[PDB]
From a paper:
Nuclear pore complex (NPC) is present in the nuclear envelope (NE) of all eukaryotic cells and mediates nucleocytoplasmic transport. A vertebrate NPC consists of four circular scaffolds: a cytoplasmic ring (CR), an inner ring (IR), a nuclear ring (NR), and a luminal ring (LR). IR resides in the central layer of the NPC and bridges the outer rings CR and NR. In this study, we report the cryo-EM reconstruction of the IR subunit of the X. laevis NPC at an average resolution of 4.2 Å, with local resolution reaching 3.8 Å.
We identified 30 molecules of nine distinct nucleoporins in each IR subunit, including four copies of Nup93, six copies of Nup155, four copies of channel nucleoporin hetero-trimer (CNT, each comprising Nup62/Nup58/Nup54),13 and two copies each for Nup205, Nup188, NDC1, and ALADIN. The IR subunit displays a 2-fold symmetry, with a cytoplasmic half and a nuclear half separated along the NE. The central scaffold associates with four CNTs on the side of the central pore of the NPC. All six Nup155 molecules in the IR subunit are located on the NE side, with their β-propellers directly contacting the NE. The elongated α-helical domains of Nup155-2 and Nup155-3 interact with each other in a roughly head-to-tail fashion, creating a homo-dimer of ~290 Å in length. The ALADIN–NDC1 hetero-dimer bridges the gap between Nup155-1 and Nup93-2 in the cytoplasmic half of the IR subunit. This analysis suggests a weak interface between neighboring IR subunits, which is consistent with the observed contraction and dilation of the NPC pore. However, the symmetric IR subunit is placed on the NE asymmetrically, tilting toward the cytoplasmic side by ~10°.
Author numbering:
A (entry chain H): 359 to 398
B (entry chain I): 282 to 350
C (entry chain G): 156 to 187, 319 to 402
The structure:
Amino acid sequence: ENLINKWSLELEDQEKHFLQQATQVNAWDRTLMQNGERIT
Amino acid sequence: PQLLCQDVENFQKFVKEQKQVQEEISRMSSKAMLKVQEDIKALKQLLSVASSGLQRNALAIDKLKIETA
Amino acid sequence: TLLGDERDAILAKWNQLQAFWGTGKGFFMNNTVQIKQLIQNPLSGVDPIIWEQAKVDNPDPERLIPVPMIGFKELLRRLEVQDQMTKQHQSRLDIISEDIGELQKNQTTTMAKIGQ
C-alpha cells in the first residue's frame, strides 16, 4: 500500500503546482492583452 | 493478481506521465509578459514626447505663415 | 478492494481523459454573435456545468471567451503562446518607437528650418 500512497501524494502535489502554473499563465495572458491595448 | 499488479503499474505510469506535463508547465514560466507592460508604458511616453515636439512646431508654423504673409 | 479503487481514482486523476482530471481542471479566458454560437453547445469534453460556471466567472467577457485548459501541458502551450505574443508585442512597441523617433528627428529639422 506504499506505492499507492505515493501515487495519490504526487497527484495532489503536482496538481496544486500545475493549478498555480495555469494561474500564472492566465496572469501572463491578462498582461499581454492589457499591454496590447496600449500598443493599439 | 497479475492483472491487479499490472494495472497498478500502468496507472502509476499514466499518473507520472501527467506529472511530467505538470513539470513542463513548471518550466514554461513567462517573464517577457512582464516586459510587455514596460515596453508599452515607454512607447506611450515616447509618443508623447514626439507629440510635444510637433505641438511646439505648429506654433512656429503659424508664426512663419503670418509673418511671411 | 478499496485499494484498487483508490488506485483507479489516482489513475483517472492524473490523465488527459478529464475523469476528474486530477484537480487539474482549470479554465483560461482566451480573447475572442458567433461568440454566442461558440461559447454554448459546450466544448471538446469540458462538463457543461463547469463551463457555464466559467462563462459566469470569466472576466472581460467581451475581451475574452472561455477556453478549455487541459492539464499542465495546456499551460505549457499557453506559455508558448504567451512568449510568441510577447515577441510580437515588443516588436510592435519597436515599430511605434521607430515612428516616434523619426517624428522627433524630422520635427527637429523642421524647427531648425523655422529659424532660418
